[PDB]
């Protein structure tokens, strides 16, 4: 037999379509301020992520 579809999903045409994505969603690198106190940030944008 031939290589089944599930076995072909290893890269290539099955990679994620990521051109329209602005960045990974991440917490913030755990640093001194967060370990011991707090740090303030301001929400600049709320955006749709394709």
């Amino acid at each position: 037999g031939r290589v089944i579809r599930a076995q072909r999903k290893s890269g290539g045409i099955f990679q994620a379509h990521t051109r329209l994505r602005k960045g990974a969603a991440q917490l913030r690198t755990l640093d001194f301020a967060e370990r011991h106190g707090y740090i303030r940030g301001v929400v600049q944008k709320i955006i749709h992520d394709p």
Binding site: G1, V3, I4
Partner: protein, 46 residues
């Protein structure tokens, strides 16, 4: 067709053997309901 998939082929569209396949199946035979504890329509679960 059988060349394409373990489910392929036959003079009717049917699987042939059970679709619950073992956890330690090789790639290319690990298709269908993998290592299923049970199957069928559950009536009350937890």
């Amino acid at each position: 067709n059988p060349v394409d998939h373990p489910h392929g082929g036959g003079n009717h569209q049917h699987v042939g053997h059970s679709t619950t396949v073992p956890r330690q199946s090789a790639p290319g035979q690990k298709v269908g309901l993998i290592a299923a504890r049970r199957t069928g329509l559950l009536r009350g679960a937890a």
